[PDB]
């Protein structure tokens, strides 16, 4: 019975530690999300047409 309670609350710490990591991850990416969107969108909008390097004549 002691072991089951420990496993229970050990699981609670696991769940609590997981929530901390998930919220910290969200907090971090919120500071870069806008910068990444600008960089990624520019690469999509910049078409850069090209002819295959091996095209002859």
């Amino acid at each position: 019975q002691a072991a089951m309670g420990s496993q229970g609350n050990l699981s609670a710490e696991v769940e609590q530690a997981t929530r901390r990591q998930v919220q910290g991850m969200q907090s971090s990416q919120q500071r870069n999300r806008e910068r990444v969107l600008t960089q990624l969108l520019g690469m999509v909008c910049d078409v850069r047409p090209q002819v295959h390097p091996n095209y002859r004549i």
């Binding site: 072991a3 420990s6 496993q7 050990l10 699981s11 696991v14 769940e15 530690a17 997981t18 990591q21 998930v22 991850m25 969200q26 971090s28 990416q29 870069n32 999300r33 910068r35 990444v36 969107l37 960089q39 990624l40 969108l41 690469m43 999509v44 909008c45 078409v47 850069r48 047409p49 090209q50 002819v51 295959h52 095209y55 004549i57």
Partner: protein
Amino acid sequence: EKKEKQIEQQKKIQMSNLMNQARLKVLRARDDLITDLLNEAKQRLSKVVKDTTRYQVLLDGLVLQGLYQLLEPRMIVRCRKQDFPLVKAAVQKAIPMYKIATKKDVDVQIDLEAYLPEDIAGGVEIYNGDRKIKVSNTLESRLDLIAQQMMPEVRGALFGANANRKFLD
């Protein structure tokens, strides 16, 4: 002793299962964050498409870009009907350039019967004469094509670099 081994094994093996699931939980949360960014990017691209003065420029390039990849004597350009007036211009301004970059005369037609689904953010797809060879250059295709290659940089940009990686080989 047997009982102890059973209970002790469960205490280790149950915590292992719990820690393994916690790892999967945070990994899934991280992937959700990546998806939210990509879904926002899709909406941002739509907002750009709505701007005729920049979307027409994209189409000018996007049509010519596909033409260079096929290098066929006959082209069929397929788009969603809403954008047809701009694809028409994109083709008209693309052919003089094609005939210069490749030194090949190309007959480029736009398909007025088959259209792309109305829910495509924008862009074109180009088929060869017999419709057996096609290039897909729509905005959704470009977003994934690039995002899947830039993801290593997005991972770092959002969550930080891996402090344990020292070499780039």
